[PDB]
């Protein structure tokens, strides 16, 4: 009866739905893709997940970020016969495969800093907003994206 994959994705998508960045159906397709193309990435402090479609049902590029106090199993992006305990989730709403690849490459650099992840595990919605907002600013050649404080949410 603890948090389940569908809940995080639906939770994360709600402000994107509410703000018009993706279509209303968008979460159900993220969930389908997670069954088919899992996005669980083992990392230093805690596990990471990047639920995303390949651009379907996305209307303006946006991101929503979710922090989990208790870990949740997401099947690994790479095959390991070992589920990934996730506490950080990056929901991607990107339309262009070209733009996609840039954003996941930027995603990687963020994950490699473990103390940032340790910080994000104990930080406020406002703190994670302006911290992430800055990293988007400090990211070069990154496409235009949409990030608001509502896009930051604690879960579970």
């Amino acid at each position: 009866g603890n948090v389940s994959q569908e809940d995080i994705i639906r939770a994360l998508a709600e402000p994107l739905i509410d703000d018009g960045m993706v279509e209303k159906e968008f979460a159900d397709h993220v969930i389908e893709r997670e069954k088919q193309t899992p996005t669980g990435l083992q990392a230093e402090p805690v596990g990471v997940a990047i639920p995303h479609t390949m651009g379907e049902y996305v209307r303006e590029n946006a991101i929503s970020v979710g922090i989990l106090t208790k870990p949740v199993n997401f099947t690994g992006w790479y095959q390991s016969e070992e589920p990934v305990p996730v506490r950080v989730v990056f929901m991607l709403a990107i339309r262009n495969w070209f733009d996609i690849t840039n954003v996941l490459n930027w995603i990687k650099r963020v994950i490699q800093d473990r103390d940032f992840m340790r910080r994000l595990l104990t930080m406020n919605d406002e703190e994670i907003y302006e911290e992430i907002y800055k990293k988007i600013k400090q990211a070069p050649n990154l496409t235009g994206i949409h990030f608001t404080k509502k896009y930051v949410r604690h879960l579970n």
Partner: antibody
Amino acid sequence: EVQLVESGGGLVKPGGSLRLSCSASGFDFDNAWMTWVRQPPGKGLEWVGRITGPGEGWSVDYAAPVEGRFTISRLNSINFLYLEMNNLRMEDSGLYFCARTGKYYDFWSGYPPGEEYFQDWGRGTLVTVSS
Amino acid sequence: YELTQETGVSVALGRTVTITCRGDSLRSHYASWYQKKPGQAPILLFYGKNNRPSGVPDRFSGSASGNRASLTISGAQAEDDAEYYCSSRDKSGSRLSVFGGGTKLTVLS
């Protein structure tokens, strides 16, 4: 399963025009990337160009030799891929295939814009340019 | 050719052979491999880090290192007597694609 039929090749003279067509079945054509490849007689595969999907605005990328002379297009309501060729030369003769094109980007070690691979091909259509 | 392949390579039935593709883009991009027989459509064999399509025999395998991508056949057979092409981006960061010259594989069967 996947079926790709090419059509439109044939005998044509220098400076002429030709429209090639490819009919697709057995997969999600409307959202797939589609590629034209050619093989001159005696020679190797040569990448011609590639049309993307709806998220990419159906943008097309062209090999430098054919840029400005060939146009790639699609009709997703009948699952057709087209290559319209103008100012054809002998140098353009050979056997043309459509390929279904996948997208690959490894997360930890990949570098954008990833790599494109060709998971299904047709048997091809022959375009002969001679005088 | 940004991608360079041996013009031709020969091998004995049941023996192991490796074909290589060399280029600067291969230091930043993986490569895929295709088999091409006369009068026949190319067959995709291998792509990415360790991606072998369902249906390709397991005797086919890929590897990359530096500016060099390579394909290996383990227990070569007469059906593997064919022509072999690599593909990758031309430059680092490019939306265009290129094929190597090709390698004629002769399985002395």
